[PDB]
């Protein structure tokens, strides 16, 4: 019967991994993707399930994520190599009925462990479910060169950055009216990074990691890739003008106000007040 | 019989979207593209025609487009996904004999609707017919990377912008001798922007939307592609030259008239005299 | 028997135009390509030859190229379309035994004509056989993006321009030890500019045109592409470096002398004296 | 029997070189790749071995690489065509019993020879085996674009350059804590450049040739490609911020000191002082 790699939820993971590499966003093993799935999706594909689901004790249980299957990227794997050997780089995990751990059901072969950012992803996955009534399903991270470069020249404050990104295009304010988040620089690989990212998920859908990358949340794989792309497209325009001599004329504050009402969105009060 | 998807116009528009996709111009679902057809071009392919054509009334009467078939893209549809599904991403419509509505004949399945900028495309489609006596058949809009960044630095006046583009490459004066028209910033998706965009199309083949994108028209699918491609390359050279520190020697006014004299093209007097 | 499109030269021509389109030097219809053949090469493919060889006179006599066959690129064609229709974009011609005209034996279908730069392509062919004893066979023209931006800031002279290119990278001096020649601004498409280009071909294998493009020649297509490819890469570094604040350290004059002695090359006296 | 062209180490070569021509690194003939193999790897492919192995003496005796076969890329070959014909561009060699020369067993047809930087390969291959107890198996050289331009503006120091390369991205410190070697400008293709390059390999896994390129060494093909590309991404990040007017905030030393010991990594003490 049809291979599990030929299903919709694996083909989608293939495209987002390949296309984010050609753009130059996924040097080495940077970049991790986690997508929440449903039970009916994996029901007909019990044939390819492994005989022994390994058990890994999860650090601190999330009760809301009990009995929830997932798809994850293998830690240390390469995004470009996903299209070659999907089985060795992608795996499916499921959390037990109590929520204290997860069982690896398929993939992650050769004793491969899930991604090292699994804490931050799962803690932030739960919050987005309640904030938008369970519509968010994807958390993304990548090394976007232009957004990273802008962190070295501009202050890492949400209010200042939000106005700049909105000023770099017209579609931008429609895309992230809630604004973009930013942390202070923090050492990754720990559980402290999971809390600050999940805490910022409440008010924002994009949060920028200083000197590492960005984090974006969205319902589908396609829109999540397009969501980070839109801000990255505006990032390229901003960097060009700054090196060209400086910004001269732009969108007025009155012009930005008219945009919000026409499309029926509410711009951030903090950013628009600037 | 051979499917309509294997005809010349369906395959032709598949090329136009994919080529612009890799350029970095049409991320997410921005940009639009329409092409005018003939009754004879679609006569033998009535098999794929919808049994019941849905009816949608036009916002404002368009007498000049009565009983004319077009091919358009769908709203909220990415330019990447078209080659994966020609039927679910394109559509062919035929304006009624009165100029108030149109019927969807083929494509645009799953309650698909044409782009939200359809009034702007139909308004410019009609007015370019008067200027070119039916030669022009394509209207294209896309966010050219280097043209967007130029409006932040150069003044939004026809005389200044036209001369700078003529000096970034020798062939520019031959490709668009009429110059480029500049509009003031407006809220997209309304009807006010459609009337001003068509107003500049009477004397220009290239119209610039500040901070949003560019508009261009061409006789065929390939000529309109080169027109934007030629203008984009000129702006790319100007970006590096201006960013490198300044511009020291140039093509003089005496050389500009001599170049246009050989090829039989009349430059814009207001910008030439600058 | 395999048709002429399966010959070794036709397959080679597709490789050159296809890769130049991905590099970004042939927007719209810029660039031309011509290749020199031998009467023994086209012997087995006499069946494909047209029954009506169209005769076109030469602008000026070229006695040296008597009875010489060439394969050229048609005028007004897109380099991206060459890989799709070799017959309508390419063709073969043979110069008559007197040196005043040629006969179109295949290709250039539907009243297509060779490139308008043929007077420049043929005049430079003659002056390179004398300076190379019948070794060079290929002439290429392209609008190198990084080279055009250089002519707006650098002094338009043969000495300093050649010297600057030598410092871009180590291999630049070895590939073209004779330097490049740069003309004053002239209107393209005229015989007055072909003679100046052919005059500079006597001393150099690389020719520069301010604000327009580049000219190059080589033994075969792979060696001709490498000559232009190496030249543009050196320009890419300079534009990137110049915008950073100008050059600070570079290769000394004596250091290039040591490099020249090792590889048995004679650097240009004018440039090395700078 | 499966052809030699389908072997794992042959398919490794086709993947690594093709991924370098698409990144704009290997214009013309620049670049070469040598990978260490075992006798078991070449055992099943005895049928395709040449019956008359030509003997070529080595410049200097290499006892530490005795009886060790290698796969090499030919001299003067083009990285674009390797995928088109691996046999004519790739080759296999084996060191004799006394370590005085090598034999050609397969490939390198038509009097082809291994890359002219072969003495620079074996002098560094032998030393890297000692430092890492034989883990290293790949040597990579390529002309990265953004990397070269850094040498024209930054001081050519091992500690200073490594310090800057650490601040460009958070992953750079962990990937190469050992730093990157730097050398004075010297004439390639000589045994003197082989000694200096191999001499610095005792303390660093990467060496930078001013105005020329980079030298790579790692355990396998996949990591070796990502070993240099991590520095390439930091250079692209560095290049953009430099043209913006400088870098304003970054990772501080107090942030860097705690980063390594989180991963239990020993940083380069010389760069830590600055
Ligand atoms: O010494 C010689 O170079 C030659 O020098 C003197 O010639 C000068 C002319 O008097 C002067 O007007 C001018 O010539 C220009 C001419 O007026 C223009 O029209 C044009 O010429 C083109 C010509 O119209 C056109 O048909 C074609 O010419 C070809 C010709 O039709 C064809 O038959 C062949 O010519 C051969 C010729 O038939 C042979 O007899 C022989 O020619 C001898 C010639 O008989 C000798 O007297 C001697 O010519 C003197 C001439 O007498 C002076 O007045 O030497 C010639 C060479 O041995 O060989 C010819 C070659 O096979 O081919 C012709 C061509 O080569 O294709 O094309 C013409 C060019 O476009 O332009 C000319 C030049 O500007 O300048 C002359 C030079 O000072
Ligand atoms: Zn738009
Ligand atoms: Zn040209
Ligand atoms: Zn090199």
């Amino acid at each position: 019967m049809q291979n599990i790699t030929q299903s919709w939820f694996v083909q989608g993971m293939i495209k987002a991994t390949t296309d984010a590499w050609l753009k130059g966003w996924d040097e080495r093993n940077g970049g991790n993707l986690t997508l929440r799935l449903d039970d009916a999706d994996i029901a007909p594909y019990h044939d390819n399930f492994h005989q022994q689901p390994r058990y890994i004790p999860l650090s601190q249980p999330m009760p809301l994520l009990a009995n929830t299957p997932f798809i994850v990227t293998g830690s240390g794997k390469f995004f470009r190599n996903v299209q070659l050997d999907p089985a060795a780089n992608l795996g499916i995990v499921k959390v037990d009925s109590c929520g204290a751990g997860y069982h690896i059901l398929w993939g992650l072969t050769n004793e491969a462990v899930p991604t090292s950012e699994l804490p931050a992803h799962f803690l932030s996955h739960s919050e987005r479910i309640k904030a938008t009534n369970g519509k968010d399903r994807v958390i993304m991270h990548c090394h976007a060169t232009n957004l990273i470069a802008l962190t070295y020249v501009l202050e890492n404050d949400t209010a200042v950055f939000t106005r700049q990104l909105w000023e770099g295009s017209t579609e931008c304010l429609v895309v992230f009216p809630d604004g973009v988040g930013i942390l202070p620089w923090m050492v990754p690989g720990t559980d402290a990074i999971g809390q600050a990212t999940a805490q910022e998920m409440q008010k924002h859908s994009l949060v920028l990691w200083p000197f590492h990358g960005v984090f974006g949340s969205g319902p589908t794989l396609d829109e999540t890739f397009g969501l980070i792309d839109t801000a990255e497209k505006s990032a390229q325009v901003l960097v060009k003008v700054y090196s060209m001599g400086g910004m001269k004329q732009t969108i007025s504050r009155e012009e930005l106000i008219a945009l919000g009402k026409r499309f029926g969105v509410t711009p951030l009060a903090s950013a628009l007040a600037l």
Side-chain angles (χ1 to χ4, degrees), chain A:
Chain A
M1 89 91 94
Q2 157 160 235
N3 201 347
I4 198 170
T5 72
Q6 249 271 350
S7 66
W8 63 271
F9 54 92
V10 173
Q11 284 210 330
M13 286 290 283
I14 289 162
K15 166 185 140 185
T17 39
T18 313
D19 301 18
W21 150 251
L22 303 179
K23 299 271 204 188
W25 296 349
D26 284 273
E27 89 281 8
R28 294 201 51 51
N29 39 308
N32 27 50
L33 243 193
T34 61
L35 154 76
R36 212 155 53 99
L37 288 97
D38 271 6
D39 294 305
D41 300 322
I42 55 172
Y45 295 98
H46 279 56
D47 309 3
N48 299 113
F49 268 55
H50 275 127
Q51 305 315 305
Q52 164 59 23
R54 290 144 62 197
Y55 179 90
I56 316 184
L58 175 169
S59 56
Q60 215 286 329
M62 291 65 58
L64 201 32
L65 294 185
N67 297 305
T68 50
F70 282 84
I71 187 132
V72 278
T73 70
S75 182
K77 305 313 180 184
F78 292 125
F79 257 31
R80 64 171 320 300
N81 283 325
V82 171
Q83 90 208 274
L84 301 153
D85 200 338
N89 305 284
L90 291 183
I92 285 153
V93 317
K94 198 186 186 145
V95 164
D96 51 18
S97 44
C98 172
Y102 42 95
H103 279 268
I104 308 172
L105 312 189
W106 180 108
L108 269 186
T109 76
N110 274 37
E111 308 283 62
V113 302
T115 204
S116 186
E117 293 275 5
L118 211 64
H121 280 247
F122 265 3
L123 315 151
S124 303
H125 261 247
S126 300
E127 189 284 332
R128 295 303 296 188
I129 292 161
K130 64 83 181 173
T132 88
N133 314 349
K135 300 315 271 157
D136 321 63
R137 300 296 200 67
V138 180
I139 279 272
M140 214 170 211
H141 172 54
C142 67
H143 294 252
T145 171
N146 282 283
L147 273 173
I148 286 177
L150 277 179
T151 65
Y152 297 85
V153 62
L154 284 177
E155 184 190 327
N156 298 347
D157 171 62
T158 279
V160 193
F161 249 79
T162 35
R163 194 81 161 281
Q164 272 331 107
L165 268 73
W166 287 341
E167 274 202 19
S169 280
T170 303
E171 164 186 60
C172 261
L173 192 141
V174 187
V175 163
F176 45 98
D178 292 326
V180 61
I182 180 79
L183 296 86
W185 191 87
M186 280 177 19
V187 166
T190 67
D191 282 18
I193 60 154
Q195 290 323 87
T197 57
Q199 174 267 290
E200 280 272 358
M201 271 315 108
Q202 254 147 33
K203 303 150 313 151
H204 306 103
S205 64
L206 289 111
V207 189
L208 258 170
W209 270 7
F211 317 134
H212 197 330
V214 82
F215 269 70
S217 34
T220 74
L221 273 170
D222 309 36
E223 193 252 315
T224 18
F225 179 69
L227 163 54
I228 44 146
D229 209 338
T230 294
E232 176 65 14
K233 164 64 169 291
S234 178
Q236 221 191 318
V237 166
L238 290 163
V239 75
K240 206 143 288 173
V241 153
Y242 287 149
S243 311
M244 201 139 157
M247 191 155 208
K248 184 150 286 151
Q249 63 248 25
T250 166
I251 328 169
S252 81
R253 82 144 40 246
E254 271 66 40
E255 289 163 339
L256 283 141
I257 280 161
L259 254 188
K261 321 344 167 185
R262 153 81 178 69
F263 290 100
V265 294
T266 303
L268 269 198
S270 47
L272 187 45
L274 263 46

